[PDB]
Amino acid sequence: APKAVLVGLPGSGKSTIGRRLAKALGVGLLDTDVAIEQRTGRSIADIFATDGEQEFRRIEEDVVRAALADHDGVLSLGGGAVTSPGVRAALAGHTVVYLEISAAEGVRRTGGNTVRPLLAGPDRAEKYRALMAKRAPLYRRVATMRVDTNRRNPGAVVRHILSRL
């Protein structure tokens, strides 16, 4: 079973905080978005364009159930994984950390285009605020620890978590 599992919106810090926490405990990192590209032929934007979001979600669920059984290090999840009811039932019993961020700082952190099919195009600030309103009740229901990332630098986030494990 993992030592910790990380969830939240794009730009909260899931990949950055996960690398740094794994180095301090002595263990490996597994990132489910990276695992998906390795197993199929292609990119995340390629699968969304040829096949659709509902077929992305079925591949993501099967990857997640297997990681929770076989991996003893730190695990980082994709941003919309909590919208599947089969993902929420596999998480019950596990150690789960929710990273919180405001809408104005969150949109400024995503600013140098990694891509992101669901944030693409004009009116970026309007689309980010609509994603927050519908997911926030879902992050609160799955969590066992909540941490505020608004005025904490990344080394100080790591130390707050380490003392509560």
118 binds, among ligand SKM, ligand ANP, none (CB under 5 to 8 A by kind): ligand SKM
57 is in an annotated binding site: yes
11 is in an annotated binding site: yes
Q: How far is the CB of 96 from ligand SKM (least distance, A)?
A: 17
Q: What is the CA radius of gyration of the chain?
A: 16
Q: How many CB atoms lie within 10 A of CB 103?
A: 14
Could you give the CA distance from residue 87 to residue 38 in angstroms, rounded to a whole number? 21
152 is an interface residue for ligand SKM by CB under 6 A: no
Of the pair 33, 158, the CB lying nearest ligand SKM is at 33
Residue with the two structure tokens 């263990």: 27
- Sheet with 145-148, side-by-side order of all strands: 29-31, 74-76, 4-7, 96-100, 145-148
141 is in an annotated binding site: no
* Residue with the shortest CB distance to ligand SKM: 80
Of the pair 13, 78, the CB lying nearest ligand SKM is at 78
Contact 140, 98 (CB under 8 A): yes
Of the pair 81, 147, the CB lying nearest ligand SKM is at 81
121 is in an annotated binding site: no
Question: 14: burial class by Cβ within 10 Å (0-12, 13-18, 19+)?
Answer: buried
Where do contacts with ligand SKM occur on this chain (CB under 6 A)? 10, 33, 44, 78-80, 116-118
Q: Which residues are annotated as a binding site for substrate?
A: 33, 57, 79, 135
